[model samples]
Target: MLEKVVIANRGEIALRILRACKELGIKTVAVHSTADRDLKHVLLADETICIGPAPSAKSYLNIPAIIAAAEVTGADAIHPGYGFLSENADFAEQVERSGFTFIGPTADVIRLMGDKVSAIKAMKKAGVPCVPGSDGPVSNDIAKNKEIAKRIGYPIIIKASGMRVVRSEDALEESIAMTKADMVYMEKYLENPRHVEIQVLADTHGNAVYLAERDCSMQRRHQKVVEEAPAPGITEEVRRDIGSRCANACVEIGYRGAGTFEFLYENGEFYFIEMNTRIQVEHPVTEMITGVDLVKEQLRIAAGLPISFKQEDIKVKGHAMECRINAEDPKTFLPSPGKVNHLHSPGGLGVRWDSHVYGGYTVPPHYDSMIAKLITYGDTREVAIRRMQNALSETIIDGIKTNIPLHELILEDENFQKGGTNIHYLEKKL
Candidate 1:
């Protein structure tokens, strides 16, 4: 087992890992930028080091600085707590090459799953369902391109690096000009799909299991604002099919530790979107339902231990929901950074607030706007929803704007109450 670990990130995720490490009796080193000097993780760590300036490229993402800090601190492992360099293959390689264990999958596996085209091909070959798209790169021939587009049918989408929907042949060239890639691909974009993802855990001993699904359909600007466990209204058969496919895909890729397989669901069909090769912000919802601590599991896997539970040992219990509390304008969704004059958190049965801010804490403008996560669990979906509504009403923050009001409106929404929300639901409602 690793005796000491260096956390290469900041904010709530950094605090989350710090708690996990302390529980396991492992010493921790927190690396932060000048901007995060007073964060909870930095203060609570056994030792803290200022890696560089405030900018991420010079601090949180400074590969050499992090490795050097680990070496000087006598830390044997590094836990990149999501975002930053957590899923960066080159960073993982450098960490291991410098004689420190990376608490995730091998560098090769990260590289394999990082490429969108290659990852899709591997998932398809592994028997996982995926969206229909170009089998390979499209050629330069206009006639061949037309044939491929027609084959994929009208209203096809071109992806240079991003997506552009094209309805006519005349728009194809214009859409293709959006990106400078030497080659591009086309796919049939699904409309009004629900964004769902399955949480998976694996070990080096050929063991893997799924912790169930989270419905993140409430999205704005492609960012998930609300999430829930055991996606409401999905049939048992469909759930089992998708869960099994995701677990099998982990084995196919030699995946280790915790990861998420994202999917697009439409009209009872599931299509693979992509895989997040690290722990996710919405992981708490799955934990509430499955009773598994994913971060602790990640540490155990890094220590060369087999998975703690088998497939049959995993069972879904109550309903769980998560609301992201961001320091932003409720209407325009613009960042609201300033001193938090006063703060009060809601508490009751099954309500959990994970945050790094407090009264008098200054909200920084250089990082993500999300400052806390509000989670609630109950024996039933209706009960959970009711508890969340009460919690949001009681929560308060002063001296800076927050999205708390937005969450309240969403919980009271008619479509949301019916569990009929899709990926576009929140965006349309707002």
Candidate 2:
């Protein structure tokens, strides 16, 4: 059992993990830069260590600083929160070699499956399907390109998402120009795809389970700000099929701890995107629906505990939505870092505020601008949406610009209200 754990990140994620540590009777050490001394999680931490100055490199990203701090505290475990070197395979390996448990997958699979190209190959072997493609540098040979098109037996798209071309030698040459070194990768680009992801948990005992699916279709550009689960319109048959396969992929690769599989869903099919090897910012929604404490489970796994539940035992219970509130001008869409004049959290059932900011607390210029995540749960999707609407209205943080209005508009928007909004829907709406 992990008697004490060191948190290796800051901001809202630190607060989230700290709550889990406290609940599991584990002592918590808040590892923060000098700039984050006044942060809520820092004050709440049972023991605090100033890793370095404000900058990310000298502090959070500095492995030695973190490892030394953990050593000094005699930490039993280190939870790599959502940023810094959370997915750095070498960091975890070093942590383990330094005689501390890094609450993530082994360095082996982290290096293997963490790489997108290799992860796709791993998933393919595990019976998880991705979009069919040439799987090589797109050449300008007319016969070869034709053979590639007919060989795959599908109308394949070319180059990257930046630009696409048809099955033609000239098209390939022109498309190659839009890339670096002309080292292009071609895949079947499913049109009108929705951003859907699956949350999975695994352990060293070879047990793993997929919680459900999250519809992260709502994004400003490619960054997801709103997420809900189980994906609004995905049927059980569809979700279960993909969810199980994702779990299988985890077990196949010896993946341990929490991970999320991203996919592009369209035309009743799911295509592999990439696997996020850490607790996601949108994890609260998955927890709210499944009643799973993901952070606690991470600690359990690192301590050699099996996944407390089996695949059949897990069931999606309700709909949950998370709206990320950012400390930025909702209009200009630029970071607005300053003192939060006042902070009033939302109330009532079904509302969970995961934030480290408070009244008079300065929103530091360093780190992510997202200051809080407001999650609401309900018996149904509509109820969740309604609760989110109410929760957003009640969320009050003053003295600095925030994207609260952005979430409000989305919550009340027509397409979002209907559910299953496509990935490009929001950007087009604005």
Candidate 3:
């Protein structure tokens, strides 16, 4: 049991961690930038400290400053809530080196999964499915190109690790000119794929379980606006197969903590993308269906405790939906930072509002624009959407611009109501 924890992040996620700690009988040390002094979690935490000034580089991401705050507060562990330094391998290494527990996987595992090439190779070796590719850079030799295409199948696409893509024979030329990097890999181009991910938890006791799947396919600029659980329309057999494979991959990597394995699903097949090394913003929906506290699971694993529930103990019950309410324009999509003069949250048996903002709270200009996460749960997908519609109608915010209007349109749109729309549908529709 961790006595004191230092939350190395802020916003709604900061509040999320604080509540989890309080419920588990763990004291909290909230560290934030000077600009975020008025955040709900900063005041709710048992002890709060201003690590540095406004910008993240000098504040939230200041590794030494955070560690120093932890040392001074005499905290037992540090929870890197989601973004900032959460996935930084060096930060995890430093936290342990300074004699504090990191509430996530070991530093070595983070380092191993950080690089794209190494991560892909490791996943492939672990028997996890991946988007068929050349595995390495495709070369220009005529014989080599012919052999690679034949092995991976035709209509394949060539791409660089961080560069552009090429669909023609000049793919080698396009890949090289896109970047001068010494490394590049080619993958099959997936058009019209739905963004689905599996939530997995592993412990030091050699136990792992997959809760279920989430579909965040309603994307704009690759950002998820609406997220749903059980990824409606996926067959039970397909879900079980991919879910089991993800859990096995976690054990194979000796992974410990909560992680989401993202994949592209199309034509009844799932292709691996990347793993989010921390709890994601849309995790609430998974919790709604599986009834598990992922954050608490992370804490227990870090404290060397075995998982509380076995594989058979898990069961999927209902449907859940999450709509991210950002303080930005619906069309222009620019951050609108100002005071939230009024806030009227929705209430119902199935609706849950996870936010840190109050009627008088001011949103900082330097941080992310997301102000709240509105989640709804029901017995079916249509029922969940209806609940979301009513919740969105009841919600209100004044003074600062919010994308609540955007959420309404998405919630009622035909394509979205049909469910499992592609990641590109929202942008094209708008």
Q: Write the per-residue lDDT of candidate 2 for residues 143-184, one digit (tens) a residue.
A: 676677666654456654214655544455455455533245
Those runs of model 1 whose alpha carbons end farther than 4 Å from true positions after fitting are: 181-183
How many steric clashes does model 1 contain? 0
Model 2 misses residue 357 by how many Å?
Answer: 1.0
Instruction: Give me the overall lDDT of model 1.
Output: 0.89
lDDT over C-alpha atoms for residue 180 of model 1:
44
RMSD of each: 1.4, 2.4, 1.7
Q: Native-vs-model 2 lDDT?
A: 0.86
**Error at 353, model 2, angstroms:** 1.0
lDDT of 1 by residue, 1-430 (tens): 7889999989889989999999999899999999999898888999999999988899999999999999999998999988899999999999999999999888998888887678788899888898888766666677777887888787887766226788888877667666444457777778889998999999989988998899999999999999999798776677778888889999988999999999988888888878899999999999999999999999989988888899889888999999999999999999999999998999989999888888888989988998899999999988889999999988889999999999989988988888958999998887
Cα lDDT tens digits for candidate 3, 280-341? 99999999998999888888888889889988888888899999999999889999999999
Candidate 2 regions exceeding 4 Å error are: 136-146, 149-169, 182-184
TM-score of every candidate: 0.97, 0.94, 0.96
Candidate 3, lDDT over the whole model: 0.88
Steric overlap count per candidate: 0, 0, 0
> CA lDDT of each candidate?
0.89, 0.86, 0.88
